[PDB]
């Protein structure tokens, strides 16, 4: 399906999605036609799903915590309720189900006491409620751009 | 300092960064030269940090897991030991995502294609790490907010 030309195109566009057809041709030493037709195929077959931007600077939250929460058939539904409630809240960047059972959230605020207060009013406050682990993120070694990607507004 | 027009431009670009200035000016009802200037300015200040693509399900990992490691004992040695495990993990295929929590934990996001490749991954690269007090594995069953994370982090 994908050969090395497709993969090289995708790698360049992951670093800088502004790169035009003549630019990729000059960087990849392939004719402009060839590249044009490859890109057009990656887009029609959904391999490139979407073009977006990474936010930097004053729009990445300063303090991040990862939270894993465990609730104690009504169960499918209660996790659905908690997770839509968390999804609607500002500074909640990522929400996922895990097993039956569990919710993973990444939350971010600009003040650490604001992040404590937020946990504490919106998460530790959920009824039935067996366990919660909070993992404040002190540094990111790989995937630093994730915050700028998930960050809203 | 950001105003409503700054935010509105960013929202649309976060939506679809293929949107050109003339399309943004039509959608926002602002002269083209204002949009243009605002975009150059956000790019210069690093508010728009980077333009990227999100990969489609052919290149996304089908099975994702979050891993939480807690080190028992490697204080200057703890810091250095975590760096070592961080760098070892980062160099591995499928590793999305590595972060340090507090002085003693490593958080990783791993994608593979089966259950299975993940089990085999944990056998080989996680339970082989010496001096770990705790290992937790949280399979991602369903992403509710942020589903395009794995298309963003997917390596090719
Ligand atoms: Au916290
Ligand atoms: Au395992």
From Swiss-Prot, chain A:
CDD domains: HTH_ARSR. Keywords: DNA-binding, Transcription, Transcription regulation. Residues 21-40 bind DNA. GO terms for molecular function: sequence-specific DNA binding. Pfam families: AsnC_trans_reg_3 (PF22482), HTH_24 (PF13412). Residues 2-72 form the HTH asnC-type domain. This is Uncharacterized HTH-type transcriptional regulator PF0864. It comes from Pyrococcus furiosus (strain ATCC 43587 / DSM 3638 / JCM 8422 / Vc1). The lineage of its organism: Archaea, Methanobacteriati, Methanobacteriota, Thermococci, Thermococcales.
């Amino acid at each position: 399906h994908l050969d090395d030309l497709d993969r090289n195109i995708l790698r360049l566009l992951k670093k800088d999605a502004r790169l035009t057809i003549s630019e990729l041709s000059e960087q990849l030493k392939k004719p402009e036609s060839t590249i044009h037709f490859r890109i057009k195929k990656l887009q029609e077959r959904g391999v490139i799903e979407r073009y977006t931007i990474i936010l930097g600077e004053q729009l990445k939250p300063k303090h991040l915590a990862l939270i894993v929460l465990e609730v104690g058939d009504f169960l499918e539904r209660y996790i659905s309720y908690i997770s839509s409630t968390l999804s609607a809240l500002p500074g909640v960047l990522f929400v996922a189900k895990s097993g039956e059972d569990k919710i993973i959230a990444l939350v971010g605020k600009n003040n650490k006491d604001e992040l404590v207060k937020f946990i504490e009013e919106n998460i530790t406050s959920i009824p039935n409620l067996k366990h919660i682990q909070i993992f404040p993120i002190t540094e990111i070694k790989k995937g630093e751009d994730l915050t700028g990607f998930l960050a809203e507004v």
